[PDB]
Every structure is written in C-alpha cells, then in structure tokens.
C-alpha cells in the first residue's frame, strides 16, 4: 500500500504495477531511446558535389611535377570537400509499447523502494503565485520535485514555470527520464489512479 | 560533432621527441625521423638485453681463464676440476674473486687440482 | 530501397520447409532420343540444391 503523510489511508494499488524487480537494461534502453527522440538532428556539411567551384582539372594529368588532381572540391584539398558529409536525420528510435510500459512500471516501482514517491491527497495552491507554492514545499522538505497531478490546474501549473526545481506534469504526460531525473515525485491520489489504469 | 586533433597529436609527437632526446640532428628534432630512431632504439634495446647476458659471460670466462693460467691451469680443465668436486660457484663471482681476492682464488685452483 | 529479387532465380527455385531449394534438373529440353531412358527418368523429378551453391541462391532471392 501507499501510506500518505497527512491521513495514513490504505491506498490500495496493483502489486505488479508498483512492485516489480528493477529491469535495468529495459529502463536504460527506454531512457536512452527517449533521450534520442529529443534530438532534432539538423545539420549538414557539403560533399565535393555541393561545394561551389568548377569541375575543371587544376592542371593536366601528366607533365607537371604535381600530384595528379581532378577537382578543387576534393576532400583531400583545402576549402571544400568533407568526404562523408552529414545530412538531417531522424534519430527517433522505436520502442515497443510493452517495453515502454514495462520500463515505466519498473522505474515507478523503484520510487516506492527508494522512497522518492511521496503520494498525497489533494495538492493545489491557493492563487497563481510562485511565492505560495515555494512556501508550502518548505513545510514538506521538498525542493527538487515532479508534481504529478490528475486534474491539471492553472493555479498550480502557472506557479511552477519560474521554479526550476519544480516540474508539474499531467498524470497522462509522465515520462521515463522525468521520473528518474527528479529527486522526489509528489503524486496525487487521482494521478496514481490514472497512472495505474494507464500502465495497467 | 567535429573533432579537432591538434592537442592530442602534439602530445603524441612531443612524447616520442622526448624519447629521442640526445640523438644527432633530425633524429631529435623532427618527429618523422625521431619515430624511426625511437623504434630502432627499442628493437636494439630488446636485442641487447639478450646480448648483455652473453657479453658478460664471455668477459667473466676471459677473467677466469686469465687468472687460472697465472696459477698454471687452463679454464677448460679448471671448470671440470670444479664440477668434478661439485662446486656450484658461478662465472660472475669466480671472475669477481679472480680480480679481488687472488689468495682466495688460488684455493679453488688447488681444489680443482684434486680432481 | 528494398532489395530486388533476381527474378530469373525466382522462376527456377522454390523454397522447401527446412530452408533448402528444389530445382528442375538440366539436360531435359532437347536432344532426348540419344539419351538413355534411365537418364531421362532420373532427371524428371525435382531435386535439391547442393550446399556449395546454396549461398548463391539464398543471396539472389532473399524473400522466400
């Protein structure tokens, strides 16, 4: 069960979804793939083709003492070439649904073992002000957190932009890298219920 | 991710040119020439660890053969004299004794004269 | 792009259950009267490709 810090209610959860062995390889794969999917990969050099210049031979094949050349654009020549020029490319590598779910199920279970996962009842600030949210995290001994919530509220989401150590994702939009990154995860009882049903 | 390679190359050349320190002309100054010198130095060095053990044996043998002939016995008969008396002492020390303690050495030549 | 099958190879080989390929025997098109019937009988059924020339077949038709 998930004990709370202001109630002590026996919040029952699936023993699979929040109680697995840490499959490290799976999680590593999913987080690496996630981090790869973040790349935009916008680059190019220009091949001997794409460089500006002519296809004239600088000098004739024979007679001169020089090393037989065929182009000013050749990669062995200065200014123009680059043998294997880059091109824009999609690095987004594929991840099996079951592997992604399994990885979340894995990393989401280690937050229970490591005691990062601080499950709570209603978590919402009074008015859209960082000053308040900042003051209320000081009571809980929290600084670096991922506040996952079911009903995404403007009052909360708009009071955590400017705070660098506080991120406020929706229960639907949890991520592999995010759960691992943040020192604690303050999850709402509704969000646990949504994530339970989402991961399954 | 383009990789400049001036920092590493320089360090790699500078390492070898430090081993070529002392060599004549381009062999200390010019990497392309030094690198050969430093290899051949290593080849010769590897070789000459083998030759050192040969040269010194010769050296000792020639000291012993000299020091025994002053006492009236040739090296060939002397070593057989020592081996037939089951004396385990080596060329290194015999040659050391031959130079330093001749009055001692003489006793080995008598010890060999028995056999 | 996808690998193009060597079509001529597709028309002369067929993939069996284990992995090998059946093929029709050579020397049974013309000049049959001078051939003994025992040859022609033995050349009639389909036959398997030898392990030496299997890799050449597997290469030129990767699909089936």
């Amino acid at each position: 069960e998930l004990v709370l810090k202001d109630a002590q209610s026996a919040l029952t959860v699936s023993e699979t979804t929040f109680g697995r062995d840490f499959n490290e390889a799976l999680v590593h794969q999913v987080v690496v793939a996630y981090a790869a999917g973040a790349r935009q990969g916008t680059r190019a050099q220009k091949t001997r083709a794409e460089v500006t210049g002519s296809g004239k031979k600088p000098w004739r094949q024979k007679g001169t003492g020089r090393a037989r050349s065929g182009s000013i654009k050749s990669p062995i020549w200065r200014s123009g070439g680059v043998t294997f020029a880059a091109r824009p490319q999609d690095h987004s590598q594929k991840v099996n649904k079951k592997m992604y779910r399994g990885a979340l199920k894995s990393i989401l279970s280690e937050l229970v073992r490591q005691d990062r996962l601080i499950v709570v009842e209603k978590f919402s600030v009074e008015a859209p002000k960082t000053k308040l949210l900042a003051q209320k995290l000081k009571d809980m001994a929290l600084e670096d957190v991922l506040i996952i919530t079911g009903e995404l509220d403007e009052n909360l989401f708009l009071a955590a932009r400017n705070l660098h150590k506080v991120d406020v994702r929706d229960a639907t939009g949890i991520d592999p890298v995010s759960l691992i990154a943040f020192d604690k995860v303050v999850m709402t009882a509704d969000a646990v219920k949504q994530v339970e049903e989402m991961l399954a | 991710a383009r990789v400049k390679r001036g920092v590493i190359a320089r360090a790699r050349h500078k390492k070898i040119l430090k081993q070529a320190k002392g060599y004549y002309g381009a062999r200390s100054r010019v990497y392309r020439v030094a690198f050969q010198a430093v290899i051949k130095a290593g080849q010769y060095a590897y070789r000459d660890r083998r030759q050192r053990k040969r040269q010194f044996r010769q050296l000792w043998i020639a000291r012993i053969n000299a020091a025994a002939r002053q006492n009236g016995i040739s090296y060939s008969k002397f070593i057989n004299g020592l081996k037939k008396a089951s004396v385990e002492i080596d060329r290194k020390i015999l040659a050391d004794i031959a130079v330093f303690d001749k009055v001692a050495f003489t006793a080995l030549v008598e010890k060999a004269k028995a056999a | 792009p996808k690998i193009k099958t060597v079509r001529g190879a597709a028309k002369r080989f067929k993939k069996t259950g284990k992995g090998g390929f059946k093929h029709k025997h050579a020397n049974l098109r013309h000049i049959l009267t001078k051939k003994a019937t025992k040859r022609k009988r033995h050349l009639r059924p389909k036959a398997m490709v030898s392990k030496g020339d299997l890799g050449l077949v597997i290469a030129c038709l990767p699909y089936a």
Partner: protein, 143 residues
C-alpha cells in the same frame, strides 16, 4: 536509480569495426580486405549470382511451373484458431472479421492443427478429413 547510475546489459553493445586506424587495431591498412583486386577496390565486388563469367546456377538450370491465380486467394485455417469468432458459426465473412484470413480470400480450408473445445458449426468452408473427425468429436457440425 539516477540518470547517471543506469547501465545496459553485458553483451548488448559491441563497439563496432573501425577500419584504417593503426596496427594495434588489428584491422587497419587494408581495412580487413586484403591486397589488391576487385574486392579491395572502393565500390568493388561482383554482382549477385556471378560465378566469374561461368554460366550461373540460376541460368544453367531450367525454369519450371506457373504461378496460380487461385492459390493467391485461398487460405489454410488452423483448427486451433477457429473458436475465436461468434460462438460457433464460421461462414467466411465472420472468419474475416476475426482477422484470421485476408479480405480477398473466397475459398478457405480448415486443417488438423489441433485443439478444439467448443462445438462449432462450420458452414461453407471446405473441411479436411482429419479436422472433420475433430470438429465432430468436440460437438460441432459441418454444413
């Protein structure tokens, strides 16, 4: 687990061959492709089924048979994947909606793949002699 403390399984990653990088590399100078000849050359290597100019196997052998138009549009329904439709009625259009056979398949056949439990009335499908025994042993009728 931290973002740094994660690591892959042993055996998963294997570096990759990097040719032309010194003696120690092993492969290096002639990147594992010997001395001279067509195979050493950049963009070298002969085409598929080339036996040096000798008439290739895929041409010295004779070509046989014809591809049937009918065999493309017939199926081979495994008996195990039969009780997965609508109680116990497997016409063809019902079997198609179960995603067992393709859309453009007008003839179909139920072979002895094994394992039946529920009684299935097979109407329209051509049924095998081995499967006719099983389907009727389970309780299901045919036609």
């Amino acid at each position: 687990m931290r973002l740094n403390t994660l690591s892959p399984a042993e055996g998963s990653k294997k570096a990759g061959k990097r040719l032309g990088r010194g003696i120690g590399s092993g492969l290096g100078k002639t990147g594992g492709r010997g001395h001279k000849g067509q195979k050493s050359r950049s963009g070298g290597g002969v085409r598929r089924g080339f036996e040096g100019g000798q008439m290739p196997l895929y041409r010295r052998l004779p070509k046989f048979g014809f591809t049937s138009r009918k065999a493309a549009i017939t199926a081979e329904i495994r008996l195990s994947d039969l009780a997965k439709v609508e109680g116990g009625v497997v016409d063809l259009n019902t079997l198609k909606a179960a995603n067992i056979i393709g859309i453009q398949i007008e003839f179909a056949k139920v072979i002895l793949a094994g394992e039946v439990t529920t009684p299935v009335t097979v109407r329209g499908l051509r049924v095998t002699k081995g499967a006719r025994a099983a389907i009727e042993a389970a309780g299901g009728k045919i036609e």
